[PDB]
Amino acid sequence: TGDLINTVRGPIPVSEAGFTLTHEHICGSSAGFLRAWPEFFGSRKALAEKAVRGLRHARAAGVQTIVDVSTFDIGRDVRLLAEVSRAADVHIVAATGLWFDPPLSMRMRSVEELTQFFLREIQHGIEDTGIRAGIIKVATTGKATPFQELVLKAAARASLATGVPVTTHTSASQRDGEQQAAIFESEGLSPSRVCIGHSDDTDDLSYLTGLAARGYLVGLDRMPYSAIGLEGNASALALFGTRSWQTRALLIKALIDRGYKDRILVSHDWLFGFSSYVTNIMDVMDRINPDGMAFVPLRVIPFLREKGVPPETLAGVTVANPARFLSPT
Amino acid sequence: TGDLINTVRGPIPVSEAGFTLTHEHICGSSAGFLRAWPEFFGSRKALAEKAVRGLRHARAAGVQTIVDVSTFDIGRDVRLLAEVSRAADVHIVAATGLWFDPPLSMRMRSVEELTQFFLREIQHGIEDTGIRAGIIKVATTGKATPFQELVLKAAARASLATGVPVTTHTSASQRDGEQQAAIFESEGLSPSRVCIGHSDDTDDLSYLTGLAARGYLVGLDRMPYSAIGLEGNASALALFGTRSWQTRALLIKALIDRGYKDRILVSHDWLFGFSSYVTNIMDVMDRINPDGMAFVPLRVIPFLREKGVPPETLAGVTVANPARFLSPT
Numbered sequence: 001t002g003d004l005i006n007t008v009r010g011p012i013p014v015s016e017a018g019f020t021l022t023h024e025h026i027c028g029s030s031a032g033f034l035r036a037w038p039e040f041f042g043s044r045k046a047l048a049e050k051a052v053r054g055l056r057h058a059r060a061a062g063v064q065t066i067v068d069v070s071t072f073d074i075g076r077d078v079r080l081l082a083e084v085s086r087a088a089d090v091h092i093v094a095a096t097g098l099w100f101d102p103p104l105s106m107r108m109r110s111v112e113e114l115t116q117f118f119l120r121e122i123q124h125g126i127e128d129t130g131i132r133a134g135i136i137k138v139a140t141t142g143k144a145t146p147f148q149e150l151v152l153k154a155a156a157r158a159s160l161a162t163g164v165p166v167t168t169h170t171s172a173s174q175r176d177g178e179q180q181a182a183i184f185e186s187e188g189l190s191p192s193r194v195c196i197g198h199s200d201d202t203d204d205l206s207y208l209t210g211l212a213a214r215g216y217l218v219g220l221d222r223m224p225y226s227a228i229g230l231e232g233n234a235s236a237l238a239l240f241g242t243r244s245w246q247t248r249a250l251l252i253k254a255l256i257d258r259g260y261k262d263r264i265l266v267s268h269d270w271l272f273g274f275s276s277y278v279t280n281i282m283d284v285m286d287r288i289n290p291d292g293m294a295f296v297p298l299r300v301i302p303f304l305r306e307k308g309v310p311p312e313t314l315a316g317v318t319v320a321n322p323a324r325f326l327s328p329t
Numbered sequence: 330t331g332d333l334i335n336t337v338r339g340p341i342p343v344s345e346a347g348f349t350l351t352h353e354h355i356c357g358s359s360a361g362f363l364r365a366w367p368e369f370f371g372s373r374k375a376l377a378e379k380a381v382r383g384l385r386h387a388r389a390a391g392v393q394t395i396v397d398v399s400t401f402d403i404g405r406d407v408r409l410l411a412e413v414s415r416a417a418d419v420h421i422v423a424a425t426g427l428w429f430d431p432p433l434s435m436r437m438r439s440v441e442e443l444t445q446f447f448l449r450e451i452q453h454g455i456e457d458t459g460i461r462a463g464i465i466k467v468a469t470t471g472k473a474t475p476f477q478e479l480v481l482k483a484a485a486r487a488s489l490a491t492g493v494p495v496t497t498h499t500s501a502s503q504r505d506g507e508q509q510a511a512i513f514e515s516e517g518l519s520p521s522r523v524c525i526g527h528s529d530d531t532d533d534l535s536y537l538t539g540l541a542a543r544g545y546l547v548g549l550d551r552m553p554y555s556a557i558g559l560e561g562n563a564s565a566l567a568l569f570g571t572r573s574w575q576t577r578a579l580l581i582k583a584l585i586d587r588g589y590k591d592r593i594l595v596s597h598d599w600l601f602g603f604s605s606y607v608t609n610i611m612d613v614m615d616r617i618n619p620d621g622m623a624f625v626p627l628r629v630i631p632f633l634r635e636k637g638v639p640p641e642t643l644a645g646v647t648v649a650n651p652a653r654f655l656s657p658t
C-alpha cells in the first residue's frame with residue numbers, strides 16, 4: 001500500500017491497478033490528426049463510443065487497467081483517454097516518449113531538450129491538461145537511428161529522475177533489445193525499469209532469455225496478432241505475421257518454464273482506431289479478434305492454465321509484474 | 330468588387346487584401362507541437378506577442394495581408410493565427426495541403442482521401458474552428474516521392490473543386506517546378522492557379538521564364554535569406570544560402586524586364602517561431618533581418634524603384650498579382 005501511479009483520471013494506489021495490460025492503445029494515429037480529421041474515424045464520438053464498448057468488454061473479462069503507450073507522435077489524445085477511462089471505469093496510464101514517427105520539431109532536438117520534454121509530460125502534465133504520464137515509450141526498427149540513440153538516452157534520464165518505467169517497440173526479429181539494453185545501461189538505468197516490447201514477435205528464446213537473465217521485463221504484447229487465413233492480404237500479412245496466437249502464448253509458458261515468471265509482461269497492442277496504417281485495417285483486426293482487449297483474459301490465460309501454469313503464477317504475471325513495473329522506483 | 334477570400338477572421342473582399350505577402354508563416358513547427366511543448370517558444374504568450382509586434386511592424390510598412398502557408402504538418406495553429414491577426418489588424422489567409430513532413434496517418438492516404446481532407450479545410454473549416462483555408466500548400470525536395478505525386482494531384486483536385494490556388498515549396502536548384510507543373514497539368518489545373526515557390530533560390534532564368542511563359546506564378550519568396558557574413562555557421566549556411574538579398578531582388582527586375590510582371594509574387598518566407606530546425610535559429614534570423622516581414626516594403630521595393638521599376642508596376646506585383654491569385658477562380 002502507499003505507492004501511487006498516475007492515470008488519466010489522476011493518482012491511484014498501485015494496489016488498485018489489478019489485472020493490467022501493459023502495451024495497448026485507444027487510437028494509433030499521428031500528432032494533431034484526430035483534431036484535424038476526426039471524420040477519418042467516422043467521428044470523434046464514434047471512436048470514443050467504440051473505445052468505451054471495448055474497454056467495458058475488457059473490464060467484464062477482469063481487466064482493471066491498461067497502459068496506453070501512445071506517445072505524442074502516435075497522436076495520443078489525453079482528453080480522449082480520460083473520457084473513455086471515465087465512461088468505461090477502467091484505469092488508463094498515459095505515456096510520454098517518442099515512437100518511430102517523430103516530426104522535424106522533435107528530430108532536431110538534443111538529448112537535453114528531449115529529456116526536458118519527457119520530464120514536462122511526467123512531472124507537469126500533458127499539453128494544458130495536468131494529466132501526467134506514468135510510462136516512457138521509445139522505439140527502434142532495427143539498428144537505432146542517430147536520433148533514436150538520443151531518444152533512448154533521454155528516456156533513461158527521465159526515468160532516473162522520476163522512477164517512471166521505460167517501454168520499447170522493437171523489431172524483435174532483428175533483436176533490437178540488445179542494443180536498446182546497451183544504451184539504457186550506458187546511462188545507468190536499471191534493467192528492472194525497462195520492458196523490451198514486441199518480444200513475442202520472435203521465437204528466439206536465446207535472445208529473450210538473455211534479456212530476462214539481465215533483469216529486463218520481456219513484453220509479450222502482441223497476443224492476438226496473426227494473419228493466418230488472410231495470407232492474400234499483403235498489408236494484413238505484413239503487420240500481423242504468420243504465427244498463431246497459440247505460438248505467441250507458448251512463449252509465456254516457455255519463459256515461466258525457464259524460471260523467468262517475474263520478468264514477463266503480457267498484452268495485445270490493440271486499438272479502437274487506427275489511422276497510421278492502411279484504410280479499413282480496423283475492420284480486418286476486428287474480424288481477427290472480435291474480443292479486442294478481452295482476448296488475453298478470455299483466451300490466453302485459460303490456454304496457459306490448461307497447459308498447467310498455476311493460478312498463482314498467472315496472477316503474478318498479470319498483476320504483480322505490472323505493479324512492480326509501474327510503481328515509480 | 331464582390332469577389333471574396335477567406336481569412337482567419339472570416340471573409341474579406343478581394344479588393345481589401347491590398348499589399349499582400351504570399352508566402353509567410355507565423356510559426357514553422359510541427360503538428361501538435363505548440364500544444365505539447367509551448368515552452369520551446371518561451372511560451373505561447375511570448376510567441377503571440379512577438380508575432381503581433383512583427384505584424385504591426387509589417388503593417389506600418391504598408392503590408393495589409395499575409396498568406397500563412399503553414400500546413401497541418403508545419404504545425405499550423407489557426408487559433409494562434411486568428412489571435413495575432415486580430416491584435417495586429419493584418420489579414421491572414423490560412424492554408425491547407427501538406428508540406429514535406431507528413432506523418433504516417435497522412436502518408437498512408439490515397440489521392441481520394443487527401444482530396445477529401447483538403448476539401449474539409451477549405452469548405453468546412455480547420456479542426457473545430459470553422460476557419461477556412463484560402464490556399465493549398467504542397468512540396469517537393471527534388472523529384473517527387475510517390476506520396477508527393479498523390480499530394481500534388483489531390484491539391485489539383487481540391488483547387489478545381491473550389492477555385493482556391495495552389496502554392497509550392499521547391500528545391501529550386503533541382504528545378505522541381507517542371508515536374509510539379511507536369512503533375513498539375515495532368516489533372517487539368519490551370520497554371521494561373523499555381524505559384525511555383527522558392528524560385529528566388531536559383532538564378533536559372535531559363536527555368537523561371539519557362540514556367541512564367543506557361544502562365545505559372547513565380548514565387549520569389551525568400552527575399553531576406555542570406556548567410557553572407559555567417560559562413561562559419563553550418564546550419565545558417567544550409568538554409569539561408571550564399572546569395573545576397575540584392576541578388577534575389579534582381580530576379581524580380583529580371584522577370585519584369587522580360588515581360589513577366591504579371592507572373593511574379595514576392596515574399597520573405599519569414600516566421601516568428603521556428604521549431605522544425607536547429608535550436609536558437611530564430612535568434613540568427615532576427616539578427617540577419619530585424620525588419621522581419623517589413624523587409625520587402627522597406628528594402629526590396631525601394632531597391633526596385635531606384636533601379637527604375639515604375640510605381641504602377643510595383644503596385645501590380647504586390648497588390649494586383651496576389652488579388653488575382655487568391656480570388657477563387
Ligand SMILES: COP(=O)(OC)OC
Pocket residue numbers: 025027028029074269270271276277
Ligand atoms: C501506434 O500504433 P500501433 O502500436 O498499432 C497497434 O502500430 C502502428
Ligand SMILES: COP(=O)(OC)OC
Pocket residue numbers: 354356357358403598599600605606
Ligand atoms: C515551415 O517552416 P519554413 O517554411 O521556415 C521559414 O521551413 C522550415
Ligand SMILES: [Co+2]
Pocket residue numbers: 169170198
Ligand atoms: Co509497436
Ligand SMILES: [Co+2]
Pocket residue numbers: 023024025069269
Ligand atoms: Co503499440
Ligand SMILES: [Co+2]
Pocket residue numbers: 498499527
Ligand atoms: Co518552403
Ligand SMILES: [Co+2]
Pocket residue numbers: 352353354398598
Ligand atoms: Co515556407
